[PDB]
Amino acid sequence: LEEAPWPPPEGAFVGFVLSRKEPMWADLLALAAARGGRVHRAPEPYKALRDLKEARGLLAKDLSVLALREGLGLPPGDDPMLLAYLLDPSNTTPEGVARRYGGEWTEEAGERAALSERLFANLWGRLEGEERLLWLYREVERPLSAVLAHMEATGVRLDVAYLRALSLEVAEEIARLEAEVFRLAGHPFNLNSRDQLERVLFDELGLPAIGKTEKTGKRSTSAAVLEALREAHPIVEKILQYRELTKLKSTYIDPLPDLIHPRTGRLHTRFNQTATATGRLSSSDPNLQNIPVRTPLGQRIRRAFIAEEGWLLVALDYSQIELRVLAHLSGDENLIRVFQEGRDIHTETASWMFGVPREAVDPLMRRAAKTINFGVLYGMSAHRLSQELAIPYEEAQAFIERYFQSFPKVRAWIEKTLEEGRRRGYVETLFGRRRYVPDLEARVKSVREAAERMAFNMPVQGTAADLMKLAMVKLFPRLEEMGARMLLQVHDELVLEAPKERAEAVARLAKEVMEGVYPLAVPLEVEVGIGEDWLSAKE
DNA sequence: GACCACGGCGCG
DNA sequence: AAAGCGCGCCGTGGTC
Numbered sequence: 124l125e126e127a128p129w130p131p132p133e134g135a136f137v138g139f140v141l142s143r144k145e146p147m148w149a150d151l152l153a154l155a156a157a158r159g160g161r162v163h164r165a166p167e168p169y170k171a172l173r174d175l176k177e178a179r180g181l182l183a184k185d186l187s188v189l190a191l192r193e194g195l196g197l198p199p200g201d202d203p204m205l206l207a208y209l210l211d212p213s214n215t216t217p218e219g220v221a222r223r224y225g226g227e228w229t230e231e232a233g234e235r236a237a238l239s240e241r242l243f244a245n246l247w248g249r250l251e252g253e254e255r256l257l258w259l260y261r262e263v264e265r266p267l268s269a270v271l272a273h274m275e276a277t278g279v280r281l282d283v284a285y286l287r288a289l290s291l292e293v294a295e296e297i298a299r300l301e302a303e304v305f306r307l308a309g310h311p312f313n314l315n316s317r318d319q320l321e322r323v324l325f326d327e328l329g330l331p332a333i334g335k336t337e338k339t340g341k342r343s344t345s346a347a348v349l350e351a352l353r354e355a356h357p358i359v360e361k362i363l364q365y366r367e368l369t370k371l372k373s374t375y376i377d378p379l380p381d382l383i384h385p386r387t388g389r390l391h392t393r394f395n396q397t398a399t400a401t402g403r404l405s406s407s408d409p410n411l412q413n414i415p416v417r418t419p420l421g422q423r424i425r426r427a428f429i430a431e432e433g434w435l436l437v438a439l440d441y442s443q444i445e446l447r448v449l450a451h452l453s454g455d456e457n458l459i460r461v462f463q464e465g466r467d468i469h470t471e472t473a474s475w476m477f478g479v480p481r482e483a484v485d486p487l488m489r490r491a492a493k494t495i496n497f498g499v500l501y502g503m504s505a506h507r508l509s510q511e512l513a514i515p516y517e518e519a520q521a522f523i524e525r526y527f528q529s530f531p532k533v534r535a536w537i538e539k540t541l542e543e544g545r546r547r548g549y550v551e552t553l554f555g556r557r558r559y560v561p562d563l564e565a566r567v568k569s570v571r572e573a574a575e576r577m578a579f580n581m582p583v584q585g586t587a588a589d590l591m592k593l594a595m596v597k598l599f600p601r602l603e604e605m606g607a608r609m610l611l612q613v614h615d616e617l618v619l620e621a622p623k624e625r626a627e628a629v630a631r632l633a634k635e636v637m638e639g640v641y642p643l644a645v646p647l648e649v650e651v652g653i654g655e656d657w658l659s660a661k662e
Numbered sequence: 663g664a665c666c667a668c669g670g671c672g673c674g
Numbered sequence: 675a676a677a678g679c680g681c682g683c684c685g686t687g688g689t690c
């Protein structure tokens with residue numbers, strides 16, 4: 124391209140280079156723009172940002188987040204990554220997309236700007252005639268990138284002092300556990316090494332190996348294996364407790380306080396828009412979509428996520444979302460009827476599981492039943508089912524047969540979905556988001572059947588994902604108008620932050636927006652809570 | 663120092 | 675572990 128002075132004209136595509144991948148932490152090393160056979164390189168990148176009306180190009184959101192960080196209201200616009208991701212969700216990296224659609228991802232901003240321009244041209248062309256994918260781009264993905272930029276730049280408050288204190292307490296208990304484990308082993312070793320632990324359990328102590336690891340075929344020391352060995356030796360329960368504590372300390376308690384941003388005083392994640400096979404978002408650096416909640420210590424950690432002083436967190440979560448979606452997709456009368464009657468399948472399974480009346484089911488019981496309900500739906504084996512329920516194999520098989528015999532059109536929907544995936548080479552969500560599954564025609568059964576589980580899951584998980592994205596796009600401007608903030612998405616959950624005076628109004632509004640986003644054959648129900656911290660807001 | 667595969671496990 | 679699906683991050687073991 125012909126080199127030309129900064130600034131570029133309107134509609135130009137940007138290229139940019141960051142010192143590190145995370146936009147909230149990155150130095151803007153270079154900035155350029157391309158349009159009409161010209162490339163414009165900015166002598167001073169930060170100041171040059173002010174000249175742009177929008178960030179149009181590869182990874183547009185990252186530049187937008189950096190702009191917002193610097194106090195500049197620069198929205199992201201067209202991004203070839205989003206076009207490519209819709210065409211084929213295995214398109215996840217600029218490296219791959221460039222290679223596939225007409226160029227090379229290099230480390231020079233001008234080259235990135237020029238690449239953005241031509242990739243957009245090519246990809247836009249491939250989306251001609253693809254009316255449904257075009258709709259998803261214009262109505263969902265492109266607007267959502269703006270919403271996500273604001274969420275990333277906003278961050279969430281964390282009680283750092285609390286976590287520091289908690290680390291010390293957890294360290295002392297970890298020391299107790301490891302010392303006990305070493306005593307029981309008769310000698311110290313690296314308890315963080317599963318290789319060393321395997322030898323202790325299975326070679327030194329008398330314990331029977333139960334399972335093998337996937338890639339290298341070592342004797343597994345996974346939680347499932349240790350659970351089954353709980354009564355065989357006192358060391359097992361001690362290892363399980365050590366694992367829980369060290370996992371939580373090493374992954375959350377210790378790293379998170381170190382990641383508070385010096386300017387904002389908050390914790391900032393990345394919401395990756397082109398990262399999953401189904402259309403879900405992912406979260407990284409740090410991942411805020413896997414903050415603990417199941418165990419007592421996990422709950423103590425989740426409580427560290429707090430509202431700003433004078434504000435409250437609002438948490439909203441779609442009820443039984445994939446089951447409702449499945450009802451719509453399959454058109455099963457029985458399942459549709461369940462939701463029209465305001466029933467709860469998770470609670471019902473739980474009452475059966477623990478052998479108590481439906482009223483006796485506590486949240487932890489219901490949560491246990493969730494894994495069982497979705498596990499069975501998406502192809503869990505009776506053996507695993509019997510194992511995790513500690514019921515005879517015969518009981519497990521019986522639960523699975525009744526699970527499906529109750530809802531006839533579900534299996535039919537599955538069969539049709541798989542048959543159609545074999546024919547077209549892809550499956551699709553309600554809105555037409557696609558996932559290619561070539562292994563549906565694999566000649567190897569285990570490979571083929573794994574592919575089948577991936578394939579029929581995708582329309583369900585993906586439709587739920589599409590619905591949440593659409594809801595975020597609708598909700599965001601309403602929140603802006605109310606002075607509320609959208610902070611996090613966790614798949615079928617949103618966490619907002621609202622001024623205390625407006626918190627109740629915001630909760631009601633958000634619930635209605637989420638429930639009314641795109642009506643299905645069954646009602647969408649959203650549960651909502653309000654609190655000073657993430658845990659309190661979910662109760 | 664960074665990268666990697668792996669086993670493992672946190673969430674949905 | 676086992677025929678649930680979808681992710682990202684941990685330490686280890688290892689390489690470069």
Ligand SMILES: NCCCC#CC1=C(N)NC(=O)N([C@H]2C[C@H](O)[C@@H](COP(=O)(O)OP(=O)(O)OP(=O)(O)O)O2)C1
Nearest residue numbers: 440441442443444445446490493494497614615674679
């Ligand atoms: N390890 C976490 C324990 C609880 C769980 C779970 C899920 C599992 N195991 N598998 C899924 O596919 N899940 C998919 C299907 C769900 O519909 C969706 C949202 O998860 P959720 O909000 O926890 O469950 P829910 O929306 O079905 O139920 P509710 O509690 O929100 O009413 O995510 C969730």
Ligand SMILES: [Mg+2]
Nearest residue numbers: 440441442615
């Ligand atoms: Mg839910």
Ligand SMILES: [Mg+2]
Nearest residue numbers: 440441615616
């Ligand atoms: Mg949820």
Ligand SMILES: [Mg+2]
Nearest residue numbers: 667668669670
């Ligand atoms: Mg892995």
Ligand SMILES: [Mg+2]
Nearest residue numbers: 318668686687
């Ligand atoms: Mg290893």
